[PDB]
Design a binder for this molecule. Structure first.
Ligand SMILES: *[C@@]12=NC3=[C]C([C])=C([C])[C]=C3N([C][C]([O])[C]([O])[C]([O])[C]OP([O])([O])=O)C1=NC(=O)[N]C2=O
Length: 107
């Protein structure tokens, strides 16, 4: 059971431009509150800053990255999100999109 989102890297702050049906149902947010925004709205108090940094650097360096983050639903309840971000480049080597597979690993 996984969800899938696409982030536009041609825009500076990598806003989300497509999310799967499961992503909305897992987090409780609608497309009116997800599209056009950065995925960081899912984070909160217990989210490890050290893990968030691993993603920030991989995006700035144009690499892939797999982290385990604590995220929060719209109702504020926490869940554990195994996140894997993958860069998508053009033939000139420039990153156009970042793609993400999110898995709820709360078991
Ligand atoms: C988020 N999923 C997600 C999916 C993709 C494709 C990308 C590129 C990032 C995420 N994030 C991270 C978020 O967008 C942001 O990059 C990070 O917060 C680190 O950058 P900053 O500048 O904020 O330090 C995801 N973050 C989540 O918490 N949950 C996901 O599903």
């Amino acid at each position: 059971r996984h969800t899938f989102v696409v982030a536009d890297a041609t825009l500076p702050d990598c806003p989300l431009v497509y999310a799967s049906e499961g992503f909305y149902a897992m987090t409780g947010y609608g497309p009116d509150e997800v599209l056009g925004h950065n995925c960081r709205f899912l984070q909160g108090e217990g989210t490890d800053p050290k893990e968030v940094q691993k993603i920030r650097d991989a995006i700035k360096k144009g690499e892939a990255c797999s982290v385990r983050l604590l995220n929060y639903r719209k109702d504020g309840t926490p869940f554990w999100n195994l996140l894997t971000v993958t860069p998508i480049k053009t033939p000139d080597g420039r990153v156009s999109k970042f793609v993400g597979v999110q898995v709820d690993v709360t078991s």
